[PDB]
Design an enzyme around this catalytic site. Structure first.
Site, PDB file in Angstrom:
ATOM      1  CG  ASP A 131      -0.564  17.717   7.957  1.00 46.31           C
ATOM      2  OD1 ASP A 131      -1.267  17.313   8.916  1.00 46.31           O
ATOM      3  OD2 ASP A 131      -0.258  16.999   6.978  1.00 46.31           O
ATOM      4  NE  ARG A 135      -0.798  13.243   9.374  1.00 44.53           N
ATOM      5  CZ  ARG A 135      -1.381  13.767  10.449  1.00 44.53           C
ATOM      6  NH1 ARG A 135      -1.429  13.074  11.577  1.00 44.53           N
ATOM      7  NH2 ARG A 135      -1.929  14.971  10.402  1.00 44.53           N
ATOM      8  CG  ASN A 136       3.042  14.957   7.654  1.00 41.57           C
ATOM      9  OD1 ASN A 136       2.862  14.059   6.821  1.00 41.57           O
ATOM     10  ND2 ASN A 136       2.081  15.777   8.047  1.00 41.57           N
ATOM     11  CG  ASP A 149       3.738  14.882   3.491  1.00 37.40           C
ATOM     12  OD1 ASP A 149       3.030  15.910   3.359  1.00 37.40           O
ATOM     13  OD2 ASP A 149       3.522  13.813   2.879  1.00 37.40           O
TER      14      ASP A 149
HETATM   15  C1  LIG Z   1       8.914  13.056   1.870  1.00 37.73           C
HETATM   16  C2  LIG Z   1       8.800  13.083   0.475  1.00 37.73           C
HETATM   17  C3  LIG Z   1       8.019  14.065  -0.118  1.00 37.73           C
HETATM   18  C4  LIG Z   1       7.873  14.167  -1.491  1.00 37.73           C
HETATM   19  C5  LIG Z   1       8.547  13.264  -2.291  1.00 37.73           C
HETATM   20  C6  LIG Z   1       9.322  12.281  -1.727  1.00 37.73           C
HETATM   21 CL1  LIG Z   1      10.067  11.235  -2.729  1.00 37.73          CL
HETATM   22  C7  LIG Z   1       9.459  12.196  -0.350  1.00 37.73           C
HETATM   23  N1  LIG Z   1      10.206  11.250   0.213  1.00 37.73           N
HETATM   24  C8  LIG Z   1       9.627  10.167   0.779  1.00 37.73           C
HETATM   25  O1  LIG Z   1       8.448  10.004   0.805  1.00 37.73           O
HETATM   26  C9  LIG Z   1      10.364   9.230   1.421  1.00 37.73           C
HETATM   27  C10 LIG Z   1      11.672   9.245   1.691  1.00 37.73           C
HETATM   28  N2  LIG Z   1      12.134   8.196   2.373  1.00 37.73           N
HETATM   29  C11 LIG Z   1      11.213   7.310   2.723  1.00 37.73           C
HETATM   30  N3  LIG Z   1      11.471   6.197   3.402  1.00 37.73           N
HETATM   31  C12 LIG Z   1      10.620   5.247   3.784  1.00 37.73           C
HETATM   32  C13 LIG Z   1       9.273   5.422   3.770  1.00 37.73           C
HETATM   33  C14 LIG Z   1       8.433   4.419   4.190  1.00 37.73           C
HETATM   34  C15 LIG Z   1       8.946   3.226   4.640  1.00 37.73           C
HETATM   35  C16 LIG Z   1      10.282   3.002   4.705  1.00 37.73           C
HETATM   36  C17 LIG Z   1      10.793   1.795   5.239  1.00 37.73           C
HETATM   37  O2  LIG Z   1      11.751   1.242   4.770  1.00 37.73           O
HETATM   38  N4  LIG Z   1      10.257   1.379   6.399  1.00 37.73           N
HETATM   39  C18 LIG Z   1      10.711   0.196   7.143  1.00 37.73           C
HETATM   40  C19 LIG Z   1       9.612  -0.773   7.385  1.00 37.73           C
HETATM   41  C20 LIG Z   1      10.020  -1.981   8.152  1.00 37.73           C
HETATM   42  C21 LIG Z   1      10.658  -2.923   7.176  1.00 37.73           C
HETATM   43  C22 LIG Z   1       8.743  -2.663   8.654  1.00 37.73           C
HETATM   44  N5  LIG Z   1      11.080  -1.798   9.142  1.00 37.73           N
HETATM   45  O3  LIG Z   1      10.872  -2.359  10.253  1.00 37.73           O
HETATM   46  C23 LIG Z   1      11.821  -0.511   9.177  1.00 37.73           C
HETATM   47  C24 LIG Z   1      13.109  -0.815   8.472  1.00 37.73           C
HETATM   48  C25 LIG Z   1      12.152  -0.019  10.584  1.00 37.73           C
HETATM   49  C26 LIG Z   1      11.184   0.597   8.445  1.00 37.73           C
HETATM   50  C27 LIG Z   1      11.092   4.034   4.256  1.00 37.73           C
HETATM   51  S1  LIG Z   1       9.743   7.897   2.110  1.00 37.73           S
END
Ligand SMILES: Cc1cccc(Cl)c1NC(=O)c1cnc(Nc2cccc(C(=O)NC3CC(C)(C)N(O)C(C)(C)C3)c2)s1
Length: 266
Positions: A131, A135-136, A149
């Protein structure tokens, strides 16, 4: 996989069960790091638990700069949690669509070198992603990209669509699509085409056209990832090596593939 005590985890903000930004207390209380926290709400089925903890178990086998770091899990207490490093800039596709046109060619090629190094690691560990898509991929504050992901037709190689033959070589096809996603700042592959129209074009030999401002060598490399015969595709080792050589001789990236003018403006 480290079992984390719930007293060490705080949830501060909802990102996207749910995904939280929070803090984790580590090293016997001596350190505190920002983390992402993914939960599995009560009522989850046995299948959901197996997929949920299975993704953490897979993440936990890897130790690579371009693969997301697992901090640990909370399974002995409910709701269960997976806890990773926090990637400040979120998913790569959404990030690029927010930053359209703002990076240099060299920076974009650097992101792809990182993703490719992560995939080479995965493939050499005998894991097929199946996948792989922007997006991942997650992006941290230093613009480092990490395959993240681990748990859709237009990223999938033809032999994987039709025969379910997923291999590292079908991941290479997907990586070529990711190359096109990066160089276009997150365009939708094949634009308005439906899934059936994508299959029609690919099997007729059509391939995605060159992004704007795309080095000729980069477009050539993504085109090679989309060879119909999987045996003719580059290995991830080839991809990392080529990207490395381009970055080290960066005038090589000044020769652009012609951007095909889809629109007549005189
Ligand atoms: C990948 C994964 C798999 C299994 C379990 C876990 Cl806990 C994880 N980890 C995660 O999903 C994630 C780790 N870090 C993540 N960071 C994340 C995800 C979604 C949004 C954001 C976030 O802050 N996005 C902002 C969104 C906005 C505010 C619009 N601006 O412009 C910026 C700062 C550029 C990006 C951060 S998600």
């Amino acid at each position: 996989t480290t079992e984390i005590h719930p007293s060490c985890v705080t949830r501060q903000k909802v990102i996207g069960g749910e995904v939280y930004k929070g803090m984790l207390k580590t090293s016997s209380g001596k350190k505190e790091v920002p983390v992402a926290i993914k939960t599995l709400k009560a009522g989850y089925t046995e299948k959901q638990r197996v997929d949920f903890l299975g993704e953490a178990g897979i993440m936990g086998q890897f130790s690579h700069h371009n693969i997301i770091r697992l901090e640990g899990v909370i399974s002995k207490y409910k709701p269960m949690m997976i806890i990773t490093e926090y990637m400040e800039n979120g998913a790569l596709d959404k990030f690029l669509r927010e930053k359209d046109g703002e990076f240099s060619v060299l920076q974009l090629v650097g992101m792809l070198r990182g993703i490719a190094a992560g995939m080479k690691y995965l493939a050499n560990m005998n894991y097929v992603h199946r996948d792989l898509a922007a997006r991942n991929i997650l992006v941290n504050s230093n613009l480092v990209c990490k395959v993240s992901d681990f748990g859709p037709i237009r990223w999938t190689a033809p032999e994987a669509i039709s025969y379910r033959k997923f291999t590292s070589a079908s991941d290479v096809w997907s990586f070529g699509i990711v190359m096109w996603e990066v160089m276009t700042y997150g365009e939708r592959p094949y634009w308005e085409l439906s899934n059936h129209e994508v299959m029609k074009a690919i099997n007729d030999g059509f391939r995605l056209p060159t992004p704007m401002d795309c080095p000729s060598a980069i477009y050539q490399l993504m085109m090679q990832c989309w060879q119909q015969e999987r045996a003719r595709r580059p290995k991830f080792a080839d991809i990392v090596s080529i990207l490395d050589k381009l970055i080290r001789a960066p005038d090589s990236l000044k020769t652009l593939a012609d951007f095909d003018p889809r629109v007549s403006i005189r």
